[model samples]
Target: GSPWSLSCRKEQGKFYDHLLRDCISCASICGQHPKQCAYFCENKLR
Candidate 1:
């Protein structure tokens, strides 16, 4: 898991489904919600 995986999972306001897909679509420009999207992005790369 990525460094932010566990932390991001604990964020009740966010959804992994949407966050993960958002990372795939705009990982480099993940400014909307960098915390969650960055986590999913790094996790997916692994």
Candidate 2:
């Protein structure tokens, strides 16, 4: 199943990290919103 996923187009910004695909690096990594990154888990974290 697919779900809403957040992404950054430009990789020149400090908040853009293709490896993590998120701006927050000090948090638990979208722990409260698992469904939002379902696409990432299926494709990247497979």
Please report, in order, the local distance difference test score of every candidate based on alpha carbons: 0.41, 0.38
For candidate 2, what is the lDDT?
Answer: 0.38
For residues 1-46, what per-residue lDDT tens digits would candidate 2 score against the true structure?
3222564444332233445655532123433324444334334343
Best by TM-score: 2
Error of 1 at 33 (Å): 2.1
Evaluated against the true structure, the overall lDDT of model 1 is 0.41
Off by over 4 Å in 2: 1-33, 43-45
Q: List the residue pairs that clash in candidate 2.
A: none
Q: Distance (Å) between predicted and true CA of 15, model 2? A: 11
